[PDB]
Amino acid sequence: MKERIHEYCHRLHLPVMAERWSAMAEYASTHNISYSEFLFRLLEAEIVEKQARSIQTLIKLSKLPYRKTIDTFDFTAQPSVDERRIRELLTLSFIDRKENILFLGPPGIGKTHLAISIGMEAIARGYKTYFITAHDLVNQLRRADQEGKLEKKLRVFVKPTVLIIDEMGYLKLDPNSAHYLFQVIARRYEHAPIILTSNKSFGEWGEIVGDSVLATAMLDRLLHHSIIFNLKGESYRLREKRLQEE
DNA sequence: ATGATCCGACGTGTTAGCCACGCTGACTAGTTATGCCATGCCTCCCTT
DNA sequence: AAGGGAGGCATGGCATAACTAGTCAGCGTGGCTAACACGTCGGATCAT
Numbered sequence: 001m002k003e004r005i006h007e008y009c010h011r012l013h014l015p016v017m018a019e020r021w022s023a024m025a026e027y028a029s030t031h032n033i034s035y036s037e038f039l040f041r042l043l044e045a046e047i048v049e050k051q052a053r054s055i056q057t058l059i060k061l062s063k064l065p066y067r068k069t070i071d072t073f074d075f076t077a078q079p080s081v082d083e084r085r086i087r088e089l090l091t092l093s094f095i096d097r098k099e100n101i102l103f104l105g106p107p108g109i110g111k112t113h114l115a116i117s118i119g120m121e122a123i124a125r126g127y128k129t130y131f132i133t134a135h136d137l138v139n140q141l142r143r144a145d146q147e148g149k150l151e152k153k154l155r156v157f158v159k160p161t162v163l164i165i166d167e168m169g170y171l172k173l174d175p176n177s178a179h180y181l182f183q184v185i186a187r188r189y190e191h192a193p194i195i196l197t198s199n200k201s202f203g204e205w206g207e208i209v210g211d212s213v214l215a216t217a218m219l220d221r222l223l224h225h226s227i228i229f230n231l232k233g234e235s236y237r238l239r240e241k242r243l244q245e246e
Numbered sequence: 247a248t249g250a251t252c253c254g255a256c257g258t259g260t261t262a263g264c265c266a267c268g269c270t271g272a273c274t275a276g277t278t279a280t281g282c283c284a285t286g287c288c289t290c291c292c293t294t
Numbered sequence: 295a296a297g298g299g300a301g302g303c304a305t306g307g308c309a310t311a312a313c314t315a316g317t318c319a320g321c322g323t324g325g326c327t328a329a330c331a332c333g334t335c336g337g338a339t340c341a342t
């Protein structure tokens with residue numbers, strides 16, 4: 001009969017339930033527990049494992065290079081940013097408010113770290129997330145359009161609840177393809193937040209995309225509902241380099 | 247029983263004349279298109 | 295990579311309105327028929 005239970009558990013797609021079947025049976029036998037409560041505990045454990053696996057699969061699907069969180073961010077080394085605003089962002093009220101989040105400042109000041117932390121927080125609370133660099137997004141959209149499947153990739157870039165655009169400005173975008181980026185900003189406008197990190201000021205966006213009018217339209221659509229952080233201070237990579245040297 | 251030869255009949259080509267079919271226009275009737283709503287099937291995405 | 299679930303789009307049915315096809319009549323043009331002549335094919339008969 002035990003083999004039948006194991007086969008049924010595997011067939012119903014409950015691997016962990018079968019794995020811990022003997023342990024839970026022994027626990028129930030040793031200590032008297034109501035059947036309802038025992039099933040509640042088993043289903044809760046299965047749901048916890050399923051949630052962990054789903055979060056890991058979402059992390060894999062969302063191309064996050066390195067996993068980080070707010071807990072690992074040192075506000076003392078970066079006093080230019082108020083921790084209160086970051087904590088308010090972590091509440092994910094902007095998702096309901098459709099507000100974007102723009103990080104600006106010199107390289108290595110934690111912009112990417114903060115963006116990844118916000119993305120991880122969104123993923124944990126069950127919100128679909130996606131991470132990509134601006135150059136990669138533009139190149140992928142261009143390649144999809146050249147294949148006559150731009151709409152599919154546009155859906156791919158629009159479907160995520162939280163889209164992260166990292167390093168917008170380090171590499172100049174091809175003028176013939178900048179519009180692709182605008183499309184995303186045009187379709188995610190008032191629909192889903194965008195977390196964009198850059199080292200260039202807004203006035204220079206025209207240089208990045210090579211079209212002043214398109215850059216102005218993109219900025220107007222992006223900044224309509226957004227929270228802008230102007231981070232300052234010394235580079236964290238250089239700080240670590242000095243600490244290692246010293 | 248088969249092949250060759252000779253004879254007779256039928257088919258074809260040509261020309262002329264006549265009759266029937268095709269085209270066009272008008273009018274009337276019947277069928278198709280379209281809009282709207284509801285249901286079913288196909289496709290896409292996610293999970294194992 | 296395969297199966298299951300969910301969502302979206304396409305189809306069908308029904309009702310109404312409009313456009314097109316059918317029919318009839320008249321006129322014009324093309325095809326069929328008839329007659330005659332000639333050539334070819336089929337049938338019959340005789341010989342091996």
Ligand SMILES: Nc1ncnc2c1ncn2[C@@H]1O[C@H](COP(=O)(O)OP(=O)(O)OP(=O)(O)O)[C@@H](O)[C@H]1O
Binds near residue numbers: 068110
């Ligand atoms: N305050 C901080 N606390 C902890 N780690 C930090 C902090 N600031 C930066 N780092 C780490 O330093 C490295 C570079 O920082 P990060 O990429 O977040 O900065 P950035 O401004 O987005 O960089 P860049 O523009 O050069 O790409 C990463 O490992 C990041 O985790």
Ligand SMILES: [Mg+2]
Binds near residue numbers: 111
């Ligand atoms: Mg960075």
